[PDB]
């Protein structure tokens, strides 16, 4: 099995290393999003 196609190059970036957070809603399906919901406040501690 030769790697004939899709020799994807993997690059690394450190611009948003400490500023990237992964949020997920276990109760909200992926079909409906919170784009139309007007966000009011986001209180977070470093």
């Amino acid at each position: 099995d030769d790697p004939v196609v899709q020799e994807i190059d993997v690059y690394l970036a450190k611009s948003l290393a400490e500023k990237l957070y992964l949020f997920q809603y276990p109760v909200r399906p992926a079909s409906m999003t919170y784009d139309d919901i007007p966000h009011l406040s986001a209180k977070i501690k470093p």
Binding site: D2, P3, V4, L20, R28, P29, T33, D36
Partner: protein, 146 residues
Amino acid sequence: IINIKKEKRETDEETKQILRMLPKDVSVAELLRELSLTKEEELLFLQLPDTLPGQPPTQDIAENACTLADLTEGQVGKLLIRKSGRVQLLLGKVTLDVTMGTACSFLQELVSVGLGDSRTGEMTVLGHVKHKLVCSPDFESLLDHK
């Protein structure tokens, strides 16, 4: 009635209880439809091994975990797609195996919390995450080598 504010059926993959009138994929076909079928970009999430095949460059170390933060920018490896659905990731002298993780069906979004100021921050919605990949060391090849 609002088309986006309907009820929620238990099956997340089949939330369409009322209308106006999925088979398990594979990483090779996933990349094929991501690149060959269309040129549209997509945000993905992948799990990587705790230890990478490399030494932290002047990072003040004890054979600890070589995290991604210790590495620098630039090309670090190549994603290879072989025949018969074989998919690997070369990260130097070793090749890890890449497979599909748990198929999430709820809302997984990728955002960046950029704290530009001590009391002011800009949260940027990068996008939505649909698939999850997992990379694992190929212990069989390493044992067959030595």
